[PDB]
Amino acid sequence: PAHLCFRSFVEALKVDNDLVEINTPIDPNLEAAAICRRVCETNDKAPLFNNLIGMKNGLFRILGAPGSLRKSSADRYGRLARHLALPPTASMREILDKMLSASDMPPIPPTIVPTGPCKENSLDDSEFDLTELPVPLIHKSDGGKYIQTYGMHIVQSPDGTWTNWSIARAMVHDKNHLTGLVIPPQHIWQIHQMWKKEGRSDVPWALAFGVPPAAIMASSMPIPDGVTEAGYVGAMTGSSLELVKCDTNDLYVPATSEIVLEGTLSISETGPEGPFGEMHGYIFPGDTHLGAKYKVNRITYRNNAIMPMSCCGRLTDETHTMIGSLAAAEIRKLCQQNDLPITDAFAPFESQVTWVALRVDTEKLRAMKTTSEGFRKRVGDVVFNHKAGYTIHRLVLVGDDIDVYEGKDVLWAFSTRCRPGMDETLFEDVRGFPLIPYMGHGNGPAHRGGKVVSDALMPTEYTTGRNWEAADFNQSYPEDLKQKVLDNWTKMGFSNHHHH
Amino acid sequence: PAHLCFRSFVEALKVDNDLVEINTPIDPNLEAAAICRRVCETNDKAPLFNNLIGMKNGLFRILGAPGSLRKSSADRYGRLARHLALPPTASMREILDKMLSASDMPPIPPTIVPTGPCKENSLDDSEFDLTELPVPLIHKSDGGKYIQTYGMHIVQSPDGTWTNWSIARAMVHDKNHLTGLVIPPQHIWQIHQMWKKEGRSDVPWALAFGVPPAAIMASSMPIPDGVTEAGYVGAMTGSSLELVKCDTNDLYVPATSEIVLEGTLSISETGPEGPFGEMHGYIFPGDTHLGAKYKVNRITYRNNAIMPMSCCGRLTDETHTMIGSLAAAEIRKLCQQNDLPITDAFAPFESQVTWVALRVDTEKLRAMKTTSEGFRKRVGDVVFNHKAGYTIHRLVLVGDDIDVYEGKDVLWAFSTRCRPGMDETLFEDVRGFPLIPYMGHGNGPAHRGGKVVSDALMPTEYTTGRNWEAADFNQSYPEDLKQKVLDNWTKMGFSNHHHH
Numbered sequence A, B: 001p002a003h004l005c006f007r008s009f010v011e012a013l014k015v016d017n018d019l020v021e022i023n024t025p026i027d028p029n030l031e032a033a034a035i036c037r038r039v040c041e042t043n044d045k046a047p048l049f050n051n052l053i054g055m056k057n058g059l060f061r062i063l064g065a066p067g068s069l070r071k072s073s074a075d076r077y078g079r080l081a082r083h084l085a086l087p088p089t090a091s092m093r094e095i096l097d098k099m100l101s102a103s104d105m106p107p108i109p110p111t112i113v114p115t116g117p118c119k120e121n122s123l124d125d126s127e128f129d130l131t132e133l134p135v136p137l138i139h140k141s142d143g144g145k146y147i148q149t150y151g152m153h154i155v156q157s158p159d160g161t162w163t164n165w166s167i168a169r170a171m172v173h174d175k176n177h178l179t180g181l182v183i184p185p186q187h188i189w190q191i192h193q194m195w196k197k198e199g200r201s202d203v204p205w206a207l208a209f210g211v212p213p214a215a216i217m218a219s220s221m222p223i224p225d226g227v228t229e230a231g232y233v234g235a236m237t238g239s240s241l242e243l244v245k246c247d248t249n250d251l252y253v254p255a256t257s258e259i260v261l262e263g264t265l266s267i268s269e270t271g272p273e274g275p276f277g278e279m280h281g282y283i284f285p286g287d288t289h290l291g292a293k294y295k296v297n298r299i300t301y302r303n304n305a306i307m308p309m310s311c312c313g314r315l316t317d318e319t320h321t322m323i324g325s326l327a328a329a330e331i332r333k334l335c336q337q338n339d340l341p342i343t344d345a346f347a348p349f350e351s352q353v354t355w356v357a358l359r360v361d362t363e364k365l366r367a368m369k370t371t372s373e374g375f376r377k378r379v380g381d382v383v384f385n386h387k388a389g390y391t392i393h394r395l396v397l398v399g400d401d402i403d404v405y406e407g408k409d410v411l412w413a414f415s416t417r418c419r420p421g422m423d424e425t426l427f428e429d430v431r432g433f434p435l436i437p438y439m440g441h442g443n444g445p446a447h448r449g450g451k452v453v454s455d456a457l458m459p460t461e462y463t464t465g466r467n468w469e470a471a472d473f474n475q476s477y478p479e480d481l482k483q484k485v486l487d488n489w490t491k492m493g494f495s496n497h498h499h500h
């Protein structure tokens, strides 16, 4: 099935009339990514580049925009739904509920199988050269060719008890090394730290590209510390994932992975990394810093291997649809587990996924007999002191009338119900997300502060209940009249389809 | 011409295929406004209600949505352009430049003519009853029938030197009185205050509905204290406006006004006023307060008179397209006159026109050798201590790459370049706009504070120049490549018209 095998997922996008196969030569130097960028800015069909200039020994084709948006509202999130076995018309609430469903289920550990498509071909350390592959230059000022934008890093705690799957960017350093981001509080960093404190060896590592779609979704979600993503994906899908052992180490990769790199993440070496055109929509030319260094010892791959690529930047791509929404999902759950009356959470695209809107059950709120200043503090302490809140700099509290999955309604509530200053609490003594330009390239500490809880609950929502009606068609006219107007609309001469 | 005569303006909307004439009976009790509300929420054609239940002695037809948006991007602002003799494809910059153009021109005083269409019919104090006219109930919880949503109040200083034209709401109180908002710092209030201090008589008043479109645009703009709107409209249009004297007082109304009320604004009496479904998108049921009271002594009107109506509320209507944009225009000019390097200003619809984005000439800024904290303070002191800043609670400073007329780009800049708290200055000791829910129905003083300058200029924009490129199709790919991609777009299989 498409959610459990990336090749099958590509076929599903075709069947959905959501793929464009480009069979003529395309340059991995900027051209593939430029096509992908336009797709993402216009919600077009995903591009599959089957003829990539420099493709050598079956490595590789590229699929862009794997988790980006479709043009119609009816199946807007269809590509995400296709990651998860959901109907293509699934709502974001349905997608995020699916991604949270495993959080109160027993893990279903993976099943080891003796082989799989990812072993169809191999290159040893004398046979590959990462500088000779058709690795894309994704943005014109990037500091390297970013091979790794939509694969899954696999690292395990020294004691063997936790195996983490996550997305973090990496670029080619030389024929057999990558550099990439390994930054706190991310789990690849937490595990790295464990190996560095033990001080004995580099971290055994694999990076698997074109993994089961349900696995790359969990890879992009801040599920709890110490939780093995494979078992969470198993529980979510109702099926044990099939994994094969790496050839050169004892980690386990999805059997149907398109491309697998095996090697080590250094506990001592660094190399130049970045800059990279990033999720908030910017690149700072020449802004290179030392990053984590990976050694690649072996490559295995499927016949006619396909590399997924996220051509991230301005709206809308995987960095918004997945990073933002999946953080929001975890935050929703985290608030509920802390006895806060939050029903829904989403990171508005309009905020460049730097805000999360929290919909409040105001009946519950009223029973708490609290105030804005107290509640704002409680909510921000829960979220901004937790890893799930890392990427999010503004929380917007809204009452039950607001659909947090509709950015227009979040912006309306924020703009009209939250008094600047008085209705907000700033948080300076929390971890900040340095990738946001106003952090890493801003006026203050790159790694600390710059966070805020903005209360767009109105005063009576804490006391006696909502005391307004919207000045809109829905709320300022009785039902019988509204329906009469709608029924007579085209007849009178005005203009009107859901699908389209 | 359409900009100088409301009847001609209605004909222009027809010719533009931007009118729906409804010739079957429509109830002024909510039905007309419900149709108007749906038009405004969907950017449909303006409705002209030619058969209004209760229309008596030629009073009246209704035109809704006179200054609202059209559906296509090419002539989005066509109805505003039709107020001003501009091409229907005029940009907002072009519209606001037209509205500012008279600010460095000599006024062209009005011309008195002996009669006009507004004298075709008359009703004395024994012949009309405002409770018997088809005055609309615009929102189901309004506290009265709001006759006055798009007419022009006309009041003159006691000394005769300043005659102000402005829009302020008013509702029917009884057979021969209205109540309405007369609030500081508005010019109707400033003039009222002058008459109250002189203490001798009620304020001679007229309210003219269906006035020259160029006059209702100026009516909605905070041009300076002491400036007679008629002369500013004269200068803007290049033509002296033709005015006729009122029958029962010595004020002068546009000759082609559809409907004219003549009477007095009391210096002593008040009456219940509101609530009203307002520009920020809300109504607070039962929230009635004492407002200004008007006595009507005489009504004159055109044959087949047409009452314009603004069915205001959630996006998008005249309260957003005119209040917000025309305040932004005046603010732009005010900043420039105070030697601040502002090139453009607009109130994003997404902010419910409570923000104004100020585009900065950063070459000029760099020459000033200043800082964010200093510049933010200077800009907020200029704007928030002036009447032009009254309605605006958040100013967003952006560099030259941002098109402030594009809300998506303002939201991107705000969300990614302004660090909450550190990059902002709050203003508590300025006049606030009580209509905003978080003010009048909020946690703090209804009339004071709640304002903020948010600096979305990046640090190097003050020093050495922009130091990023956007991670977008426009900026992260060379020209030759971009054009190749666009030229091959449909050929490869992707999808694409300006008008649609």
Ligand SMILES: Cc1cc2c3c(c1C)C(C)(C)C[C@@H](O)N3c1c(nc(O)[nH]c1=O)N2C[C@H](O)[C@H](O)[C@H](O)COP(=O)(O)O
Binding pocket: A148, A149, A150, A164, A165, A166, A167, A168, A169, A170, A181, A183, A185, A186, A187, A188, A219, A220, A221, A222, A223, A278, A279, A310, A312, A318, A319, A322, A323
């Ligand atoms: C979907 C997606 C997620 C991420 C990234 C991208 C995509 C497409 C890149 C295009 C590669 C851009 C890059 O900046 N990137 C990225 C990243 N996290 C980082 O630490 N480092 C990164 O370079 N995340 C987010 C992380 O995947 C999540 O925060 C996840 O929660 C981490 O897993 P874990 O540590 O919770 O197990």
Ligand SMILES: Cc1cc2c3c(c1C)C(C)(C)C[C@@H](O)N3c1c(nc(O)[nH]c1=O)N2C[C@H](O)[C@H](O)[C@H](O)COP(=O)(O)O
Binding pocket: B148, B149, B150, B164, B165, B166, B167, B168, B169, B170, B181, B183, B185, B186, B187, B188, B219, B220, B221, B222, B223, B278, B279, B310, B312, B318, B319, B322, B323
């Ligand atoms: C276009 C437009 C403007 C306004 C209004 C409306 C429309 C459609 C209503 C639908 C009637 C809603 C109402 O709240 N309203 C309104 C109002 N100003 C008020 O003091 N009182 C009001 O009730 N303005 C704004 C003012 O017209 C401007 O602020 C103008 O600047 C004033 O002129 P002046 O005092 O500068 O001469």
Ligand SMILES: [K+]
Binding pocket: A165, A166, A167, A218, A219, A220, A221, A222, A223, A229
């Ligand atoms: K993860």
Ligand SMILES: [K+]
Binding pocket: A417, A418, A419, A423, A455, A456, A457, A458, A459, B438
């Ligand atoms: K609030």
Ligand SMILES: [K+]
Binding pocket: B165, B166, B167, B218, B219, B220, B221, B222, B223, B229
């Ligand atoms: K005015």
Ligand SMILES: [K+]
Binding pocket: A438, B417, B418, B419, B423, B455, B456, B457, B458, B459
């Ligand atoms: K800033």
Ligand SMILES: [Mn+2]
Binding pocket: A164, A165, A166, A187, A222, A223, A224, A227, A229
């Ligand atoms: Mn993890």
Ligand SMILES: [Mn+2]
Binding pocket: B164, B165, B166, B187, B222, B223, B224, B227, B229
């Ligand atoms: Mn004025």
